[PDB]
mmCIF file of C-alpha atoms (C1' of nucleotides) in Angstrom:
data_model
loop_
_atom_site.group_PDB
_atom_site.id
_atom_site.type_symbol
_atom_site.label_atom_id
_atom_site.label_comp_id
_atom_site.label_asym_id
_atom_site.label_seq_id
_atom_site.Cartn_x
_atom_site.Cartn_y
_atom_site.Cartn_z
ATOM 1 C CA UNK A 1 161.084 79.712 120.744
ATOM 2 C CA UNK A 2 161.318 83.480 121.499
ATOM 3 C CA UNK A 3 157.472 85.265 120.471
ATOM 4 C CA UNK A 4 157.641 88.599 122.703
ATOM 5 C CA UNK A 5 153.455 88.802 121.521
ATOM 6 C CA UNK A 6 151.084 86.322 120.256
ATOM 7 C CA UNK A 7 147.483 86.028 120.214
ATOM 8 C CA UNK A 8 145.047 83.299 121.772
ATOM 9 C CA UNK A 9 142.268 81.762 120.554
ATOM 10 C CA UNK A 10 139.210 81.440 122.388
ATOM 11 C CA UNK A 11 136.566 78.833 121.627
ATOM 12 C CA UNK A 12 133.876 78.450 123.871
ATOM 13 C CA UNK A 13 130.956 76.002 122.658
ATOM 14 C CA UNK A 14 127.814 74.433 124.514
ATOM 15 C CA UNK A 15 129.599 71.447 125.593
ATOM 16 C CA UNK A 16 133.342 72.145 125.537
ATOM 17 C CA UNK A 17 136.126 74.812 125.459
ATOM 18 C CA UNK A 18 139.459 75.157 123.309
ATOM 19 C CA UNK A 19 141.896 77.786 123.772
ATOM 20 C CA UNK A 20 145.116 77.743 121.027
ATOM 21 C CA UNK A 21 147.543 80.102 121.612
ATOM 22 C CA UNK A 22 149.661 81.760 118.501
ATOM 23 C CA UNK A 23 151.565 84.313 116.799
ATOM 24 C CA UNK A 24 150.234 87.426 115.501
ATOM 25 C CA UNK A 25 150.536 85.599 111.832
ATOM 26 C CA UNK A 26 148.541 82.587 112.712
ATOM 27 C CA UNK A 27 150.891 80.046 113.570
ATOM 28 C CA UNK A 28 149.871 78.202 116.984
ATOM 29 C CA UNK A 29 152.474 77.656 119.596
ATOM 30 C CA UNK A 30 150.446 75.310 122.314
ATOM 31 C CA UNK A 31 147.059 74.667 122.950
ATOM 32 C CA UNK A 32 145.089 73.257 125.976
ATOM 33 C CA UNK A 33 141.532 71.666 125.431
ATOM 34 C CA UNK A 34 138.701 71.168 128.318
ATOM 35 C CA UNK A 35 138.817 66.832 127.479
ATOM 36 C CA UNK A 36 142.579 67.669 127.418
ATOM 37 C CA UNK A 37 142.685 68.088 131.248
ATOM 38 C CA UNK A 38 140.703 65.150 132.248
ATOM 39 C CA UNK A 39 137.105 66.399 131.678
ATOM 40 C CA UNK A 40 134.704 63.982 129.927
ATOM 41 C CA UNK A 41 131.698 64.468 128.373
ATOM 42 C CA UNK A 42 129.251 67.255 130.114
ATOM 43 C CA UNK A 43 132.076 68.393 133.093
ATOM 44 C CA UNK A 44 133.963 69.576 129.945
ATOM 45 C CA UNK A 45 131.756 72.470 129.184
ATOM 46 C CA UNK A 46 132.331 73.951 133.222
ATOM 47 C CA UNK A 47 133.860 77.080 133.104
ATOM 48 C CA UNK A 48 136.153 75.527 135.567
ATOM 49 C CA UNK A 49 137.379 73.305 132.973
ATOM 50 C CA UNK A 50 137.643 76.253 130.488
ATOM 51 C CA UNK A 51 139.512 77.836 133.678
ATOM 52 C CA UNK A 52 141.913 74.854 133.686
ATOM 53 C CA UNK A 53 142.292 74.632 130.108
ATOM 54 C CA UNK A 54 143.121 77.734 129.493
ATOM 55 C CA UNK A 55 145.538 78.183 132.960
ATOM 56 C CA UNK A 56 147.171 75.084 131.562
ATOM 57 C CA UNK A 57 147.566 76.759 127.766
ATOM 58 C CA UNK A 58 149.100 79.893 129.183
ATOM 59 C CA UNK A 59 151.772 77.920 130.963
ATOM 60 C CA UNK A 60 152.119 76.107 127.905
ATOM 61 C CA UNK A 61 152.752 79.362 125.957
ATOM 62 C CA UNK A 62 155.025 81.301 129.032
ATOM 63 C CA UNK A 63 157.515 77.803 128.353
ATOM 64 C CA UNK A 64 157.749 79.345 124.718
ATOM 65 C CA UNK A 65 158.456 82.957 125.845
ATOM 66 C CA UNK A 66 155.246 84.882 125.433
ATOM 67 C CA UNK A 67 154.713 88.176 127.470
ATOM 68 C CA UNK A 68 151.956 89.547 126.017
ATOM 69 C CA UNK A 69 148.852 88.280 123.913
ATOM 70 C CA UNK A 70 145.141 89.682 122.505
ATOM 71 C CA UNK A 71 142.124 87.243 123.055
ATOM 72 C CA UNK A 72 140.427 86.549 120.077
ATOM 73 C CA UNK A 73 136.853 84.890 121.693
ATOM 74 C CA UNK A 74 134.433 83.279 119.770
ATOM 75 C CA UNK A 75 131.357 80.610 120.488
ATOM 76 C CA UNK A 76 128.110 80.555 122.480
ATOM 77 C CA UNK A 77 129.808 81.479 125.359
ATOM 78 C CA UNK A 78 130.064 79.125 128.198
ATOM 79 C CA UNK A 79 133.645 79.979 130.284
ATOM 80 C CA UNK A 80 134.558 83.154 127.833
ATOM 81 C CA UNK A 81 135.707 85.349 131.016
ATOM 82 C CA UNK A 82 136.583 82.800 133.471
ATOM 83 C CA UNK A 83 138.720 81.728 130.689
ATOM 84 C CA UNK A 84 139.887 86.060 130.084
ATOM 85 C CA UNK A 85 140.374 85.527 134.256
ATOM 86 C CA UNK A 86 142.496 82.389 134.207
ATOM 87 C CA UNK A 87 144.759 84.130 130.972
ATOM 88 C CA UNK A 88 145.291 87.097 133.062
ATOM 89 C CA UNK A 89 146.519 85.531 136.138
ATOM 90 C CA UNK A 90 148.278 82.501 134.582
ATOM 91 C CA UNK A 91 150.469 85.410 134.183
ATOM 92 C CA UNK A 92 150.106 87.251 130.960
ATOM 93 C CA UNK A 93 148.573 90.453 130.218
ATOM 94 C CA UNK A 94 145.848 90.502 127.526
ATOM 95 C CA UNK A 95 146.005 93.418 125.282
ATOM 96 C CA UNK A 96 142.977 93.819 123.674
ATOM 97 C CA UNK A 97 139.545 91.595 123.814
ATOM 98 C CA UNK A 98 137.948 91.380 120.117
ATOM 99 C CA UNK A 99 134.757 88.938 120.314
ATOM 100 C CA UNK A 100 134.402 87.552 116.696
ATOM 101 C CA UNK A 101 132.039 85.183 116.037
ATOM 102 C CA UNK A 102 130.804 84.410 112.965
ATOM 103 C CA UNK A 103 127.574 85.156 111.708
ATOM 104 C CA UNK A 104 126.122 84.519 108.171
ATOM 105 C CA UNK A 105 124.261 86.740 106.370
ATOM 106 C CA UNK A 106 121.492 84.547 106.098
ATOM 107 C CA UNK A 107 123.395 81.507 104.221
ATOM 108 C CA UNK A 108 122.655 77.820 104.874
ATOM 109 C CA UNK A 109 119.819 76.586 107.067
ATOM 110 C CA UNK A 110 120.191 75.295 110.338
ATOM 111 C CA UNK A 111 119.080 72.278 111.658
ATOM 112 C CA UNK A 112 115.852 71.591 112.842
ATOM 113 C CA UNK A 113 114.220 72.715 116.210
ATOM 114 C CA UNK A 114 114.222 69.412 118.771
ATOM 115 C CA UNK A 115 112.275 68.145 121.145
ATOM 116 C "C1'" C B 1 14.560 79.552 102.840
ATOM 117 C "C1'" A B 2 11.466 74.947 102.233
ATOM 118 C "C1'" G B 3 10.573 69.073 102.837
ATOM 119 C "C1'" C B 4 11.169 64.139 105.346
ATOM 120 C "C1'" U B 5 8.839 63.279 113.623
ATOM 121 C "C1'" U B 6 14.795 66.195 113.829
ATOM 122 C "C1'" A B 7 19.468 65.208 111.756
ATOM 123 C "C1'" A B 8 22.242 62.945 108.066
ATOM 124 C "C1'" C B 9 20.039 63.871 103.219
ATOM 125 C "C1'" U B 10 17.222 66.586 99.395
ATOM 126 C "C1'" G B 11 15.538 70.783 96.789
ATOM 127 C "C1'" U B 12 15.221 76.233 95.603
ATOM 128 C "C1'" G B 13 17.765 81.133 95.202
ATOM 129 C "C1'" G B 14 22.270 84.234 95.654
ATOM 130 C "C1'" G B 15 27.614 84.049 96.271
ATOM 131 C "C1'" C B 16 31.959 81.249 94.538
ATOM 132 C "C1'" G B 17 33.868 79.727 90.051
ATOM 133 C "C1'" U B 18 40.148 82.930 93.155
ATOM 134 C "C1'" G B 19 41.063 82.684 85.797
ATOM 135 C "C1'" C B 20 40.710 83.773 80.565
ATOM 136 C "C1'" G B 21 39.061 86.648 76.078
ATOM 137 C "C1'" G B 22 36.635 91.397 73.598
ATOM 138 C "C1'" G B 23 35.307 96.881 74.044
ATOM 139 C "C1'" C B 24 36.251 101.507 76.867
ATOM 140 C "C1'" G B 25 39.154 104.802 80.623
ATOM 141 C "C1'" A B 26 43.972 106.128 83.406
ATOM 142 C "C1'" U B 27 49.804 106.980 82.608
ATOM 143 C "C1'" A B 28 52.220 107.520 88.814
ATOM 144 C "C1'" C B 29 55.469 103.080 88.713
ATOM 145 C "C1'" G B 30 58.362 99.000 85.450
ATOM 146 C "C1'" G B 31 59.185 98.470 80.314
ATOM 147 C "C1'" G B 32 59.576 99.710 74.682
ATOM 148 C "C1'" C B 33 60.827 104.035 71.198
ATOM 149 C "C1'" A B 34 62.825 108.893 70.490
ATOM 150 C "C1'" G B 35 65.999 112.600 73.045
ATOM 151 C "C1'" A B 36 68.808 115.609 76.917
ATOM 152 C "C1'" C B 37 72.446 115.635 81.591
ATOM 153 C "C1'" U B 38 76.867 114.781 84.344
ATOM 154 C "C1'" A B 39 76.793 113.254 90.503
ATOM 155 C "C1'" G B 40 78.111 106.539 88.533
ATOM 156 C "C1'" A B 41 81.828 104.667 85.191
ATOM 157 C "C1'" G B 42 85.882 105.144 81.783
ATOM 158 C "C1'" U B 43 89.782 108.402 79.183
ATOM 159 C "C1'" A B 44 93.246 112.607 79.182
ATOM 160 C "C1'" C B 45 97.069 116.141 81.782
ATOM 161 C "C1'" U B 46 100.478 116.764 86.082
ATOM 162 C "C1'" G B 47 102.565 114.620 90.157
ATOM 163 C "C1'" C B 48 103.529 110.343 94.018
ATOM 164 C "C1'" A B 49 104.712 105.839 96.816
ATOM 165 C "C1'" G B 50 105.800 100.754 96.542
ATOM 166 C "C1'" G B 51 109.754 93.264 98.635
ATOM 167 C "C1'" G B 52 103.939 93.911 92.046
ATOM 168 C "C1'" G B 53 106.008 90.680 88.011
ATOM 169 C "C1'" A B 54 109.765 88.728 84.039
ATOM 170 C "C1'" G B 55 114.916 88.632 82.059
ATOM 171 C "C1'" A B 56 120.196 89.369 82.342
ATOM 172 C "C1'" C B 57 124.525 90.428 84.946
ATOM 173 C "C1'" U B 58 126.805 90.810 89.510
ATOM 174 C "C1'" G B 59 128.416 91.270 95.688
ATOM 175 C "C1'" G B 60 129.747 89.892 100.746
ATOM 176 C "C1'" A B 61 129.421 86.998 105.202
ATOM 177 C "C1'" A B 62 128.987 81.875 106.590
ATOM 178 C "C1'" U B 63 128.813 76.173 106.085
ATOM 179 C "C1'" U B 64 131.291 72.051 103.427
ATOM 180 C "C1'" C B 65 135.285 70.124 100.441
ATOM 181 C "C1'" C B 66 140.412 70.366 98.356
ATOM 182 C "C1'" U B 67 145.740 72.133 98.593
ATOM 183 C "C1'" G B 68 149.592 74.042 101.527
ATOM 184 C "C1'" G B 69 151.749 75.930 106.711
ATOM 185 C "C1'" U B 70 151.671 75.486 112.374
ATOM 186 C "C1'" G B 71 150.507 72.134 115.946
ATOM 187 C "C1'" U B 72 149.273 68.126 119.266
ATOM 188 C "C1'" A B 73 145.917 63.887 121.372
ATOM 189 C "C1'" G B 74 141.714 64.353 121.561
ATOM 190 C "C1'" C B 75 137.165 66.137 118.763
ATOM 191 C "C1'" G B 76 132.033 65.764 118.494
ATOM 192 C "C1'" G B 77 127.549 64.749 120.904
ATOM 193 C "C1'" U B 78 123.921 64.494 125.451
ATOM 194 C "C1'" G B 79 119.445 64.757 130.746
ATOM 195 C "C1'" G B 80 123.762 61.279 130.870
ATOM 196 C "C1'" A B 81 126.043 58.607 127.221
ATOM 197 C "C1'" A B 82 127.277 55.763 123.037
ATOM 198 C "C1'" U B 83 127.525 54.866 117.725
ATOM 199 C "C1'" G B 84 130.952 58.492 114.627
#
RNA sequence: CAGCUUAACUGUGGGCGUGCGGGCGAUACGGGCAGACUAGAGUACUGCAGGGGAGACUGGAAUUCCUGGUGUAGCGGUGGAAUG
């Protein structure tokens, strides 16, 4: 397919990393997770793996004929700028980096502290 | 103080009997009765701050679920894993 500018999704977590690239509507081209490039279990959260997962979703996304893209990150961050590192010299230029994360306004209640 | 060889003991005479009742005096203090005051207290007038309470309606973020797109083979979880 032919998207000139898309936008990438960014989830970093405690014990993994997910990067989904897609169009500026919301529809995801590719995607590369940290288990998706061999990582099991705690190597997964590395941000070498989120390096790797996101160098390999960037590839994934030049095959489909994006130039350009703006990082949406998100998550307790973990491999956030290794993985804004790896986007930018996978090739692509990142437009603009927008950190939402959502926070409630109070709502819910967590779980409990452990131990 | 006196007597029995002294004492224990005994006797004699005051005190004690820490209280109660009757008469008489005092009126500072507490109290009773009759007053007076506004410094306590309460009311009024004018302002002021507040997640004080009860009722009704109503707002946004987020979690979950459902429906529909896109999209693949992992997600999640941990000290590390495994049930899922």
């Amino acid at each position: 397919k032919n998207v000139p500018h898309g936008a990438a999704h960014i989830k970093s977590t405690f014990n993994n990393t997910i990067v989904s690239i897609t169009d500026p509507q919301g529809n995801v081209i590719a995607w590369a997770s940290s288990g998706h490039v061999g990582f099991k279990g705690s190597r997964k959260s590395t941000p070498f793996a989120a390096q790797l997962a996101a160098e390999n979703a960037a590839r994934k996304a030049q095959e489909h004929g994006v130039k350009k893209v703006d990082v949406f990150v998100k998550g307790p961050g973990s491999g956030r700028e290794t993985a804004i590192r790896s986007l930018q010299a996978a090739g692509l230029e990142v437009g603009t980096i927008s950190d939402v994360t959502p926070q409630p306004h109070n709502g819910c209640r967590p779980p409990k502290r452990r131990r």
